[PDB]
Structure 1
Amino acid sequence: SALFEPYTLKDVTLRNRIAIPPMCQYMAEDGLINDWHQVHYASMARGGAGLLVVEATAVAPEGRITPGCAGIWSDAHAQAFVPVVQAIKAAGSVPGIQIAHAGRKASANRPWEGDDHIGDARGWETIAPSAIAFGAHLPNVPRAMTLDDIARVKQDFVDAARRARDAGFEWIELHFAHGYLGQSFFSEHSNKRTDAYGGSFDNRSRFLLETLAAVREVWPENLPLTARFGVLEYDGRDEQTLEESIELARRFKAGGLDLLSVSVGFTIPETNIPWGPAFMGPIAERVRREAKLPVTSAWGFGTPQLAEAALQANQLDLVSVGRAHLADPHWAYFAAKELGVEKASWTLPAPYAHWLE
């Protein structure tokens, strides 16, 4: 079963091709994680997945999506992640983390408490390339960033990467997708700047390439440096947007990116996304083949046969399974059993495996 093939990238070996993608828990307070996250991540790690990417972690307080989002903007925040790393490693899984800045989609309520912008002593001004609201349920207009804002946020990403390294993460992912800060710099929908960071393809790519280059300097060369990146919007410009996105991926690769998590942009709400099980499969394959970068992707791979089929077709190097690990922390064990893998129960630690054969 290709799903249960190990995977080596730089000095890191994953015991199988199942990755748990980042999924915010909306349970931290002032960015500090707690007992919720500890049990949550240690449990999925024991489930058998080879890689576990911790949820989107803000590099700065205004970079949080919500007041419940994890943060790593101070050394105290970094230290709280230390026992999460040790517990993921102790389970045999690889700890990774996604560091993020929500840009103009920040200052929002938790999804089960409105899922929209905060009107309210809990709100904060947001920043983005240009002062243009997302629209829909995020109508707050962001402040357009100055050159000093750009230098500061890049340094936040560097500090977040450095803290992540020192906490023991072995895998880092820059959040350049889903309409957040990095994504909003790349898209013409959101970036109307006329300085060095807007207009041309080179200028729109600049924020992302510079942030990657700064992180490359503190992130160890022997540990995978990856990014999640929205390569099309389904906005009626997909062939053009896909071509630019793949070219940027080529510049990511020249800049030391080791793997790309292929996603959708979500930069604006006026879209027609063709949701379906594994619908990203063919987009990720094209990115993998044209930019010659390993990839992962997500959405609907919780059906084990779909995950297997995506790997055997070389559309993916890793399969990311999110909501299914929320439903079942031990989904990897379910998948090994579902795919007839030999000694499927030994995907779990011995206190479970011995009794489930």
Structure 2
Amino acid sequence: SALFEPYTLKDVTLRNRIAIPPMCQYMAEDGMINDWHHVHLAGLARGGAGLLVVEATAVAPEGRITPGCAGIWSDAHAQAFVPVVQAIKAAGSVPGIQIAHAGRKASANRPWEGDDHIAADDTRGWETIAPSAIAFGAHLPKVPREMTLDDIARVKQDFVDAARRARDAGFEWIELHFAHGYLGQSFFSEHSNKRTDAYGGSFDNRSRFLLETLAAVREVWPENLPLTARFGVLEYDGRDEQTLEESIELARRFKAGGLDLLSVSVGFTIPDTNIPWGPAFMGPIAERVRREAKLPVTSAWGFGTPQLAEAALQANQLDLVSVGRAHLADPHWAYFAAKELGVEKASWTLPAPYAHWLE
């Protein structure tokens, strides 16, 4: 089956086309991950997936989404990832990590603790920063502070330091989080970016933060290791064709700038939208980006049904299939998929201590 064919990008080879997308656990303390993450990630790696992308990890304290988000803004934070990276590699999966900055969506409660912006008098909260002083709205009413040019220079450097740390911690795959309405996405979107300087206004100016950050990271990230990014290419805000054209154009610039693969998603920049949720609904858009930008892609949402993952690959809509929630339900989803798609010796998708008894 296509889902179980290996994939080589740069010097890295994934044993199959199954990727576990970044999934926040909200279990870190002051950005430090712990045994929750270690067992969670090592367990997933043993499940069979070819690639495991660690959850959105903040490049700076204020870049966390919540007080439980992982961070890599110091060498001590990076050290915490070393044993985990080594465990993922021991399991045969490729260790990747998504570095990010929540922007105006930062300083929020854990999803099961309100999922909304933290109260001003809550000692856990902090000031949010963004391209412009405009709030997301809805459950995230906090108005962020408009970034100065020095703030921009600082955040870009935070991304560089985060990438450098990920590299030294042993990660073999990096993903810049330019999606889901966080800092990067908010600089590209006219909904959130009302700047009149070099970082706002035109397509070139709105693209600047993302392009400069990619270029800066590229200076420290190994040429032989996949350099990727997640990016929302449309919002489903009634401006889809114009937005998709600009997004595809930026994807072209990303490729020219050394991006090896793009994780295609939705913007989630503003709350007033009408997203047509459905199994593998991203397939068509991901395919268009892949074709018009001539860049490898992956996407997600509803690919937990093995046949859908297989179909998307065979139709060349995606190069890698990202399966998220199905892995929270069953860490060994890859084994389930192998059986479903009739892979030979499906149980050996898992380590011997398990495979021997399930064959």
TM bucket normalised to smaller: over 0.9
In 2: Cα distance, 1:129 partner to 1:37 partner: 32
Between the aligned partners of 1:84 and 1:309, the Cα distance in structure 2 is 32
How many residues of Structure 1 are paired with residues of Structure 2 in the alignment? 356
Partners of 1:202 and 1:48 in 2: CA distance: 41
Deviation string, structure 1 residues 131-150 (Cα, Å, up to 9, x no partner)? 00000000000000000000
Kindly report the root-mean-square deviation, in angstroms, between the aligned alpha carbons of the 2 structures: 0.3
Superposition deviation, residue 315 in structure 1: 0.2
CA distance in 2, matches of 1:123, 1:133: 16
Distance 1:8 1:280 in 2: 23
**CA–CA distance in structure 2, aligned partners of residues 217 and 320 of structure 1:** 28
Cα distance in 2 for partners of 1:254, 1:308 equals 29
Q: 1:253: which partner in 2?
A: 255
Deviation at 1:316, TM superposition (A): 0.2
SS of structure 1 residue aligned to 2:99? strand
Query: How far apart are residue 227 of structure 1 and its match?
Result: 0.1
Q: Could you tell me which residue of structure 1 aligns to residue 201 of structure 2?
A: 199
SS of the aligned residue for 2:219 comes to: helix
Task: Find the aligned partners of 1:235 and 1:100 in 2 and give their Cα distance.
Answer: 24
SS at match of 1:179: coil
CA drift at 1:222: 0.1
Offset, 1:163: 0.3
Quote how far apart the aligned CAs of 1:241 are.
0.3
Where do 1:161-180 residues align within 5 Å? 161-180=163-182
Q: How does 1:291-310 map to 2 (within 5 A)?
A: 291-310=293-312
- For 1:217 and 1:125, the matched residues in 2 are separated by 30
- State the shift of 1:25 in Å: 0.2
Distance 1:279 1:88 in 2: 30
Q: After TM superposition, give the deviation of residue 38 of structure 1 in Å.
A: 0.3
1:295-328 CA distance string (max 9 Å, x none): 0000000000000000000000000000000000
The Cα of 1:171 is off from its aligned counterpart by 0.1
2-side partners of 1:197 and 1:10: how far apart? 32
Deviations 1:75-109 (A, max 9, x none): 00000000110010000000000000000000000
In 1, distance between residues paired with 2:249 and 2:101?
Answer: 23
CA deviations on 1:194-253 (whole Å, 9 max, x unpaired) are 000000000000000000000000000000000000000000010110000000000000
Question: Which residues of 2 match residues 46-61 of structure 1 at below 5 A?
Answer: 46-61=46-61
Please state how far the C-alpha of 1:267 moved relative to its aligned partner: 0.2
Shift of 1:62: 0.2
CA–CA separation in structure 1 for the residues paired with 2:50 and 2:276: 29
Q: CA deviation at 1:192?
A: 0.1
SS for the counterpart of 1:98 is: strand
Superposed displacement of residue 337, structure 1: 0.5
Sequence identity percentage: 97
- 1:285 shift after superposition: 0.2
Between the aligned partners of 1:354 and 1:63, the Cα distance in structure 2 is 45
Alpha-carbon distance in 1 for matches of 2:179, 2:84: 25
How far residue 37 of structure 1 moved from its aligned partner, in angstroms, is: 0.2
CA shift for structure 1 position 341: 0.5
What is the deviation of 1:293?
0.3
Shift >3 Å, 4+ stretches: none
1:311 aligns with 2:336: no
How far apart are the structure 2 equivalents of 1:6 and 1:251? Answer: 27
Deviations 1:177-205 (A, max 9, x none): 00000000000000000000000000000
Residue by residue, what CA displacement relative to the aligned partner does 1:262-284 show, whole Å, maximum 9, x if unpaired? 00000000000000000000000
Structure 1 Cα separation of the partners of residues 47 and 257 of structure 2: 34
Residue by residue, what CA displacement relative to the aligned partner does 1:26-79 show, whole Å, maximum 9, x if unpaired?
Answer: 000000000000000000100000000000000000000000000000000000
Rounded to whole Å, the distance in 2 between the matches of 1:237 and 1:138 is: 22
Question: Matched residues in 2 for 1:29 and 1:332: separation?
Answer: 30
Q: Secondary structure at the match of 1:82?
A: helix
Give the Cα separation in 2 of the matches to 1:191 and 1:63.
18
1:344 is aligned to: 346
The C-alpha deviation readout for 1:135-179, integer Å capped at 9, x for no partner, is: 000000000000000000000000000000000000000000000
Unaligned runs of 5+ in 2: none
Structure 2: distance between partners of 1:245 and 1:103 = 20
Instruction: Report how far residue 258 of structure 1 moved.
Output: 0.3
Tell me how far apart the structure 2 counterparts of residues 325 and 82 of structure 1 sit (CA, whole Å). Answer: 23
- Distance apart, 1:123 and its partner CA: 0.6
C-alpha distance in structure 2 between counterparts of 1:134 and 1:146, whole Å? 20
How far, CA to CA, are the matches of 1:263 and 1:58 in structure 2?
A: 19
Q: Which residue of 2 aligns with 1:64?
A: 64
Corresponding residue to 1:327 among 301, 326, 329: 329
1:291 is displaced (CA, Å) by: 0.1
